[PDB]
């Protein structure tokens, strides 16, 4: 849940680090890229 990994405001226009959010973002990026590659009928090396 987001409240357990909050994005607190820094009172300067930016936010915190939230390493959990960064790792989730990386996982989502990889999953979306893999889905797009599968939908494109990729060769073995690229999907691997």
């Amino acid at each position: 849940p987001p409240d357990l990994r909050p994005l607190v405001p820094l009172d300067g226009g930016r936010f915190a680090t939230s390493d959990l959010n960064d790792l989730y973002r990386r996982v989502i990026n990889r999953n979306n890229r893999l889905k797009r590659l599968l939908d494109l009928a990729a060769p073995d090396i690229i999907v691997r």
Partner: protein, 135 residues
Amino acid sequence: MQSWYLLYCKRGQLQRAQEHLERQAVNCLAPMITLEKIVRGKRTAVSEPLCPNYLFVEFDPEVIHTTTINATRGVSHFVRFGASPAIVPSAVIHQLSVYKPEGAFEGFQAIFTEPDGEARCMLLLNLINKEIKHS
């Protein structure tokens, strides 16, 4: 004894990686086709690669090691099937150099049909993987 490898060069430094690889006496290839695409004004010669961050290289590992290529500016890494970089014979780059307007020809017609850049280089790797399976 000579090996053709495929490099996933760094994002935005295709030309820089090209000149750096050419400086190290390494034969580098970037497939070139303009497709007469439409710039903001009208249709002109854009002259864009198949899709960026992709290069072909020819180099014998005995003379120049793969670590030097990995450390070359503008290039990130190779593509390795299993645990070793993919080996590529000369048929694909002969066909690529000769035809710059059979099954590879139909692939090129596909490239001229879709112009979706990711799809153009995607079918390019599809053809090269088909030949690798043939080899």
